Scaffold this active site. Structure first.
Site, short mmCIF file in Angstrom:
data_model
loop_
_atom_site.label_atom_id
_atom_site.label_comp_id
_atom_site.label_asym_id
_atom_site.label_seq_id
_atom_site.Cartn_x
_atom_site.Cartn_y
_atom_site.Cartn_z
N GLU A 54 3.76 7.16 -3.59
CA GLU A 54 4.39 6.01 -2.96
C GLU A 54 5.17 5.15 -3.98
O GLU A 54 4.77 5.04 -5.14
CB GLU A 54 3.28 5.15 -2.31
CG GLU A 54 3.77 3.82 -1.71
CD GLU A 54 2.71 3.03 -0.95
OE1 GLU A 54 1.57 3.50 -0.79
OE2 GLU A 54 3.04 1.90 -0.50
N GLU A 58 7.81 -4.99 -2.27
CA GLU A 58 7.03 -5.82 -1.38
C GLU A 58 7.21 -7.31 -1.67
O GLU A 58 6.90 -7.76 -2.75
CB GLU A 58 5.54 -5.46 -1.52
CG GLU A 58 5.16 -4.09 -0.90
CD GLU A 58 3.74 -3.67 -1.22
OE1 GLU A 58 3.40 -3.66 -2.42
OE2 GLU A 58 2.98 -3.31 -0.27
#
Ligand SMILES: [Ca+2]
Ligand SMILES: [Ca+2]
Ligand SMILES: [Ca+2]
Length: 241
Positions: A54, A58
């Site tokens: 991943e 964010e």
């Protein structure tokens, strides 16, 4: 489902190996929220021993003027991470910015409005094997230290995505001899179900159920909403980019 809040996740149905990914967005932010653009190998969360793959962008709610970058490798229950933070101006929830992720066999690069804010090489990059899909999500984390205490009075919140561009990794064959070639663009005049999925699940540490009820298409933008359960709606004004 069983949680008290509703969030949203837009994800590509297809996964790819390497590429450049750009999304034009105005993010959501309030103490307690997570508003993102990520690359994710589906199934990474299964704790059967397989690797976790991943790459993240964010925006942590308590800090709208920056975003956290990350690469998650290792495996479920034993992740290897590399959190870093990057200032964004104007603040992420105050303006649209073009967020970019580049992933190649040699590096992972993060850009904002075409400018590099981070470039990582080495161990974790060597472990981003396989394929990843492109996703965007809007939720709230139970870790107050990470995103701040959740201020429910700020709900509902919206993340607006004006467009997305995905480029294939074509080393030495892109324009000007670059390493990427535009593959497809989605201007979000509609929700293209042949390309995207709407998430309907949750995970530990997330106080919201990701739901298809909270993905809206309006005025040329795709909208992700964070609402209290039972109050899933968007009636406001879609911002102009
Ligand atoms: Ca609260
Ligand atoms: Ca658009
Ligand atoms: Ca779904």
């Amino acid at each position: 489902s069983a949680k008290d809040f509703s969030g949203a996740e837009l994800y590509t149905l297809e996964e790819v190996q390497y590429g450049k990914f750009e999304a034009r967005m105005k993010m959501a932010a309030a103490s307690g929220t997570v508003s993102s653009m990520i690359l994710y190998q589906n199934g990474s969360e299964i704790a059967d021993g397989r690797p976790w793959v991943e790459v993240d962008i964010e925006v942590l709610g308590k800090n709208p003027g920056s975003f956290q970058s990350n690469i998650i490798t290792g495996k479920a229950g034993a992740q290897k991470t590399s959190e870093k933070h990057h200032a964004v101006s104007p603040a992420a929830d105050q303006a649209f910015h073009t967020y970019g992720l580049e992933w190649t066999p040699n590096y992972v690069r993060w850009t904002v409005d075409g400018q590099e804010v981070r470039k990582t090489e080495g161990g974790q990059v060597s472990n981003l094997t396989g394929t990843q899909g492109l996703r965007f999500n809007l939720w709230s984390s139970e870790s107050a230290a990470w995103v701040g205490q959740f201020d429910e009075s700020k709900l509902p919140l919206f993340q607006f995505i004006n467009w997305v561009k995905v480029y294939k990794y074509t080393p030495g064959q892109g324009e000007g001899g670059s390493d990427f070639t535009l593959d497809w663009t989605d201007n979000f005049d509609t929700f293209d179900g042949s390309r995207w999925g709407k998430g309907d699940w949750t995970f530990d540490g997330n106080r919201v159920d990701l739901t298809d009820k909270n993905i809206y298409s309006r005025d040329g933008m795709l909208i992700l909403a964070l609402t209290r359960k039972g109050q899933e709606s968007f009636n406001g004004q879609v911002p102009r980019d």
